[PDB]
Amino acid sequence: MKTPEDCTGLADIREAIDRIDLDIVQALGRRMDYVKAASRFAPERVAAMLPERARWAEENGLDAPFVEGLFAQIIHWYIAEQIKYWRQ
Amino acid sequence: MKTPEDCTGLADIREAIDRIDLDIVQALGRRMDYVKAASRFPAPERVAAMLPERARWAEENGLDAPFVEGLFAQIIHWYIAEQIK
């Protein structure tokens, strides 16, 4: 994939963004599959995770607050899904 | 990382998830770089076409479409505002 500076037009940009978004989706897909795995083995967890992701956003030129909110969103869905999967 | 079925304990799971979340953050980082380069040349048409598409990918990957689509709507929305900034 061309680097953003190597891109020669909107088409490159759009496809790059499509590939990246799809990677995110698949990553989320593999992420939720670990719910099944976890079952065969506290908010304290969320408390630890969010600040680590906030650091990661920083290291990637992103706005920490926004990135943090996304994962709280993602993490709460995963937890709830765990309980839901629990009641197979 | 180990596949879900390969995990032998919670450590494996927690590391896989930290690795996945980091992949997502980094992906978001690169996304912003392309969105910024876009100015060197999103319209309501583009966005209206993108969301359904992501909802589709979500389903092909065993995920909740509304949740995932909502998720990308926030991303697109927020990035749009980051550009103007």
UniProtKB/Swiss-Prot annotation, chain A:
GO molecular function: carbon-oxygen lyase activity; chorismate mutase activity; isochorismate pyruvate lyase activity
SMART domains to which the protein is assigned, alphabetical: CM_2
Protein keywords: Isomerase, Lyase
Keyword Isomerase carried by entry: yes
Substrates-to-products reaction catalysed: isochorismate = salicylate + pyruvate; chorismate = prephenate
Keyword Isomerase set for record: yes
Pathway annotation from the record: Siderophore biosynthesis; salicylate biosynthesis
Record-annotated Chorismate mutase domain positions: 4-86
Pfam families to which the protein is assigned, alphabetical: CM_2
EC number: 4.2.99.21, 5.4.99.5
Induction comment: Repressed by iron.
Binding site for substrate: R14, R31, Q82
GO biological-process terms attached to the record: chorismate metabolic process; pyochelin biosynthetic process; salicylic acid biosynthetic process
Known role: Involved in the incorporation of salicylate into the siderophore pyochelin. Catalyzes the elimination of the enolpyruvyl side chain from isochorismate to yield salicylate and pyruvate via a rare pericyclic hydrogen transfer mechanism from C2 to C5. PchB also catalyzes the nonphysiological Claisen rearrangement of chorismate to prephenate in which the pyruvylenol tail is transferred from a C3 ether linkage to a C1-C9 linkage.
PANTHER family with a match to the protein in the record: CHORISMATE MUTASE
Listed name of the protein: Isochorismate pyruvate lyase
Gene name tied to this protein: pchB
Curated annotation (Swiss-Prot), chain B:
InterPro entries: Chorismate_II_sf (IPR036263), Chorismate_mutase-related (IPR051331), CM_dom_sf (IPR036979), CM_II_prokaryot (IPR002701), Isochorismate_pyruvate-lyase (IPR008241)
Keywords: Isomerase, Lyase
Activity regulation information from UniProt: Inhibited by endo-oxabicyclic diacid resembling to the conformation of the transition state.
Consequence the record notes for mutating I80T: 4-fold reduction of the affinity for isochorismate and 3-fold reduction of the catalytic efficiency for isochorismate-pyruvate lyase activity
Entry GO MF terms: carbon-oxygen lyase activity; chorismate mutase activity; isochorismate pyruvate lyase activity
The keyword Membrane appears for this protein: no
Functional pH dependence: Optimum pH is 6.8.
Start and end residues of each Chorismate mutase domain: 4-85
Reactions that this protein is recorded to catalyse: isochorismate = salicylate + pyruvate; chorismate = prephenate
Entry's induction text: Repressed by iron.
EC number: 4.2.99.21, 5.4.99.5
Residues binding substrate, per UniProt: R14, R31, Q83
Biological pathway: Siderophore biosynthesis; salicylate biosynthesis
Subunit description: Dimer of dimers.
Entry protein name: Isochorismate pyruvate lyase
Organism: Pseudomonas aeruginosa (strain ATCC 15692 / DSM 22644 / CIP 104116 / JCM 14847 / LMG 12228 / 1C / PRS 101 / PAO1)
